[PDB]
Amino acid sequence: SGFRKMAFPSGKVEGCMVQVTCGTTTLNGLWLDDVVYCPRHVICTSEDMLNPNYEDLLIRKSNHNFLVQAGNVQLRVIGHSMQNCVLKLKVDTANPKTPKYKFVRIQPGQTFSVAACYNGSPSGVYQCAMRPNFTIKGSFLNGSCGSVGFNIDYDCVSFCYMHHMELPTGVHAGTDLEGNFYGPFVDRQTAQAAGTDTTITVNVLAWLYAAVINGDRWFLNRFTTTLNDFNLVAMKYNYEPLTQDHVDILGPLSAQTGIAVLDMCASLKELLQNGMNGRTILGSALLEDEFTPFDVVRQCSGVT
Amino acid sequence: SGFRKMAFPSGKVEGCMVQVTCGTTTLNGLWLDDVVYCPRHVICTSEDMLNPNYEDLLIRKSNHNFLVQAGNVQLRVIGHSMQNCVLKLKVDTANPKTPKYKFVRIQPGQTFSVAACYNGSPSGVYQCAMRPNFTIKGSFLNGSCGSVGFNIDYDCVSFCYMHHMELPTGVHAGTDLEGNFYGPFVDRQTAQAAGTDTTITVNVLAWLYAAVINGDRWFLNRFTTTLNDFNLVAMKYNYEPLTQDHVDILGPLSAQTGIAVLDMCASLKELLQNGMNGRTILGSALLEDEFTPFDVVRQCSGV
Ligand SMILES: *[C@@](O)(CO)[C@@H](C[C@@H]1CCNC1=O)NC(=O)[C@H](CC(C)C)NC(=O)c1cc2c(OC)cccc2[nH]1
Ligand SMILES: *[C@@](O)(CO)[C@H](C[C@@H]1CCNC1=O)NC(=O)[C@H](CC(C)C)NC(=O)c1cc2c(OC)cccc2[nH]1
């Protein structure tokens, strides 16, 4: 047993990380087949990033202005195009380590693994949750842009995040692999502020199902509730409202424990309104919200 | 900026994990060069695991009794030996993906990355610390035996742990790659307790420095303490004593923040006597002790 913040094995993503450089600006890129994906601001000088006109900055760039390196080995750029805030660079070599992959735009509350990369070399792996305000509580240093977030189902790597920005509050913002930012952020060198964050309700409920599975079930009450009533109450406590998809992904945990989702909602609502009464859940007085229902099942039944 | 429990990239280890089956028992193995290391209880049966005479059970085994699968290929075992609790399976093929590696014995309070594997296929990576009582608080299910813990220095993988056991308390026990258990544990099917679990003081202080580097300072105070007077209080709370080496290792963090180590100790002493009320540090409601000073320096340098 045991419950930990767990990342996916990073080997399949490691073989795809490369370094992209324009002039002196360097960051990370994702090499899949014969295309490298990286943040478009690599074409900016330090001064350009303050108020960049990317369309104009890109028209002054040719394939030969782009330095793409796998390690110290260069991959000649034979084509380039801009898709939203991501740059796509066609290279003359298909990545022999390209895994089965796809690009996905995740929802708030969903978790993914981040391969922290520097100069095209991953340095650490850790799991992140997309906060409801479209930030992630990551750990990123200078030169980390281009780091990607991913999940692995079966043998297919689903890329969902590429790093771009650190906010003044210390949290982080980025895009999907199609260059579309998560949240209302832009790739400018400007102090941008995210919206007020909230607790990921679906993940809190998954954490409660995790407790029940392990014999910690003192919090189960005899009431039930409607989805609408719970949402209205949940927002009064800074909790995100549940969707139909939330109820459905809680299905397996509901069937495994025999506790209907709306019953657990009624239990969680009582915890929100009355507190923990000096008690703990899974050895904690804090309600954990960065464990998705899939993380709970995967850690109560290790799948690979 | 930011601070997160973070493991090393697992690619180099993934290319080394294999599946080892003996009779009706399957677990993970580590394929380096022409040898596959795994827990020796894979040779045991249901009745053997209760009190196995491993030397007795091992000699009655043949190379063909061992099914070593590396993906869709089966490796031919051409030799079997035993080094303490680690069974060594010689194979006719050397692992092409063998990286630069060494076998090291981790010290208590030090951290390592764990590649949790099942049926020779890794499924998750997370960081652990070797607790003073020589257990680790991991996440392991049935079939996780053979999983390894490691660190990576440059291009060298330092293997330091192989998983064997989950104690009745939910914690986990294992060996180094020489088959020597961490702690007073034994690879038999018995319920085993560990010593009293003390807190890794130097790690808690590093983690306090990380909180300051990241904008958290509500726990600081104007007071200072001597090393001994802090250790008096710390030991009273089942905290490991702080040594001058620990003080020295914290230097970089103290310089970066401008907070003397003994000033942080005065803060920790207050936290231990008053508690945190309802407040949290770096999002946690407890004092985290599984971050080493090096972990903090690596994530907070320049921040
Ligand atoms: C390996 O997977 C075994 O091949 C591993 C799995 C454990 C159990 C689920 N999570 C893990 O980490 N180890 C064992 O099953 C181990 C086998 C050898 C004898 C060392 N035994 C235990 O972990 C074990 C035995 C007992 C026990 O007795 C019976 C009473 C309480 C707890 C306990 N754990
Ligand atoms: C990339 O590595 C640069 O390519 C970098 C990642 C950060 C470095 C430290 N931690 C990180 O996550 N990204 C940036 O530097 C971006 C670049 C934009 C998209 C052009 N900008 C910021 O992170 C940034 C700018 C400002 C700011 O202004 C100036 C004010 C406050 C915060 C802030 N962050």
Question: Hey, where are the domains in chain B?
Answer: 15-91, 201-298
Q: Any idea what DSSP says for residue B76?
A: P
The pairing of beta strand B156-166 with beta strand B100-103: parallel
Cα dihedral B277→B241→B167→A257 (10° resolution):
10
Residue from the list B8, B144, B302 with its beta carbon closest to the beta carbon of A141: B302
Give the method of determination: X-ray
Give chain A's contact residues with B (Cβ, < 8 Å). 1-12, 14-15, 115-116, 122-126, 128, 137-142, 166, 170-172, 284-286, 298-304
- Identify the CATH assignment for A14-91 out of 2.40.10.10, 3.40.50.1000, 1.10.1380.10, 3.40.50.720: 2.40.10.10
Total count of residues recorded for chain A: 304
Distance CA A248, CA A286 (A): 25
Put simply, the answer to whether B141 touches A302 (Cβ < 8 Å) is yes
B56: closest CA of chain A, how far (Å)? 32
DSSP H helix total and E strand total for chain B: 8, 13
For domain A100-175, the CATH architecture is: Beta Barrel (2.40)
Ligand 1 atom at minimal distance to the Cα of residue B143: 2
At A269, list the tokens: 């609502």
Distance CA B57, CA B45 (A): 10
Residue from the list B123, B125, B301 with its beta carbon closest to the beta carbon of A302: B123
Instruction: Give the active site residue among B16, B85, B128, B145.
Output: B145
CB-defined site of ligand 1, < 6 Å: B 27, 41, 49, 140-145, 164-166, 168, 172, 187-191
**Are the C-beta atoms of B57 and B41 separated by less than 8 Å?**
no
Distance CA A14, CA A165 (A): 21
Contacts of B280 (CB under 8 A, 6+ apart): A286
Residue of A166, A171, A172, A185 to mutate, ligand 2, most atoms within 8 A of C-beta: A166
Distance CA B249, CA B3 (A): 19
Rounded CA Rg of chain B: 22
Nearest CA, atom 33, ligand 1:
B191
Residue from the list B7, B11, B143 with its beta carbon closest to the beta carbon of A15: B11
Q: Would residue B38 show up in a list of annotated catalytic residues for this protein?
A: no
Amino acid at B168: P
Q: How much distance in Å is there from the Cα of B209 to the middle of ligand 2?
A: 23
Residue of A19, A86, A142, A187 to mutate, ligand 2, most atoms within 8 A of C-beta: A142
Amino acid at B95: N
In the three-class reduction of DSSP (H, G, I as helix; E, B as strand; rest coil), residue B87 is classed as strand
- Token pair 């089942």 is at which residue? B238
A44: closest CA of chain B, how far (Å)? 22
Question: Which of B13, B26, B139 is the mutation pick for testing A, counting most A CBs within 10 A?
Answer: B139
Distance CA B73, CA B64 (A): 15
One fold for A100-175 and A201-300: no
Say which ligand is closest to the CA of A45: 2
C-alpha distances (whole Å) from A294 to each of A291, B208, B263 are 8, 32, 43
- Token pair 């906010």 is at which residue? A167
At A4, list the tokens: 């930990």
At B4, list the tokens: 């997160």
Residue of B137, B166, B190 to mutate, ligand 1, most atoms within 8 A of C-beta: B166
Short-list B35, B39, B152, B14, CA closest to B95: B35
Distance CA A73, CA B268 (A): 49
A226: closest CA of chain B, how far (Å)? 31
Residue from the list B121, B170, B283 with its beta carbon closest to the beta carbon of A2: B170
Q: How much distance in Å is there from the Cα of A7 to the middle of ligand 2?
A: 25
At B201, list the tokens: 């003081």
Q: Would residue B145 show up in a list of annotated catalytic residues for this protein?
A: yes
Q: Is A169 exposed, middle or buried (0-12, 13-18, 19+ CB in 10 A)?
A: middle
Instruction: Give the active site residue among B22, B41, B128, B300.
Output: B41
A169: closest CA of chain B, how far (Å)? 9
Distance CA B122, CA A127 (A): 16
Short-list B121, B146, B34, B47, CA closest to B81: B34
**Are the C-beta atoms of A161 and A105 separated by less than 8 Å?**
no
Question: Which of A125, A152, A167, A216 is the mutation pick for testing B, counting most B CBs within 10 A?
Answer: A125
Nearest CA, atom 3, ligand 2:
A145
Check if CATH label 3.20.20.70 holds for domain A201-300: no
Q: How many CB atoms lie within 10 A of CB B237?
A: 15
Distance CA A118, CA B295 (A): 17
List CB contacts (< 8 A) between B12 and chain A. Answer: 11
- CATH tag, B15-91: 2.40.10.10
**Are the C-beta atoms of A75 and A16 separated by less than 8 Å?**
no
Q: Please provide residue B239's backbone torsions phi and psi, each rounded to the nearest 5 degrees.
A: -100, 140
Short-list A199, A200, A210, CA closest to A253: A210
Question: Which of A4, A123, A299 is the mutation pick for testing B, counting most B CBs within 10 A?
Answer: A4
C-alpha distances (whole Å) from A248 to each of A55, A210, A243, A267, A289 are 43, 16, 9, 18, 17
Q: How many CB atoms lie within 10 A of CB A105?
A: 13
Distance from CA of residue A36 to its chain's centroid?
A: 20
In the three-class reduction of DSSP (H, G, I as helix; E, B as strand; rest coil), residue B69 is classed as strand
At A228, list the tokens: 């609408």
- Identify the CATH assignment for B201-298 out of 2.60.40.10, 3.20.20.60, 1.10.1840.10, 1.10.3720.10: 1.10.1840.10
Distance CA B45, CA B25 (A): 7
Short-list B101, B204, B111, CA closest to B149: B111
Distance CA A130, CA A200 (A): 9
- Three-state secondary structure readout of chain A: CCCCCCECCCHHHHCCEEEEEECCEEEEEEEECCEEEEEHHHHCCCCHHHCCCHHHHHHCCCHHHCEEEECCEECCEEEEEEECCEEEEEECCCCCCCCCEEECCCCCCCEEEEEEEECCEEEEEEEEECCCCCCECCCCCCCCCCCEEEEEECCEEEEEEEEEEECCCCCEEEECCCCCECCCCCCCCCCCCCCCCCECHHHHHHHHHHHHHCCCCCCCCCCCCCHHHHHHHHHHCCECCCCHHHHHHCHHHHHHHCCCHHHHHHHHHHHHHHCCCCCCECCECCCCCCCCHHHHHHHHCCCC
